[PDB]
């Protein structure tokens, strides 16, 4: 069925592609980025287009509830 095909763009220039089911919760993505060395307390996720600050959303909602598109580019940014 429907998926969130994600391009992750880390700020050192590393890139990673993952796919999550549309019913996966945002937390899954947050935790994945955390395991890659980018803890939520210091980093936040921003989608390119549409532009969304995912840290402004509750992590317990699903990709579909968050309104993500079938394909997204997610920038990992240091919080400000």
Swiss-Prot record:
Location of the protein in the cell: Nucleus
The UBX domain, residue ranges: 1-76
Domain notes: The UIM (ubiquitin-interacting motif) is required to engage the NEDD8 modification on cullins. The UBX domain mediates interaction with VCP/p97.
Subunit (UniProt): Interacts with neddylated CUL2, ubiquitinated HIF1A, and VCP/p97.
Function summary: Ubiquitin-binding adapter that links a subset of NEDD8-associated cullin ring ligases (CRLs) to the segregase VCP/p97, to regulate turnover of their ubiquitination substrates.
The protein's name: UBX domain-containing protein 7
Species this protein is from: Homo sapiens
Gene: UBXN7
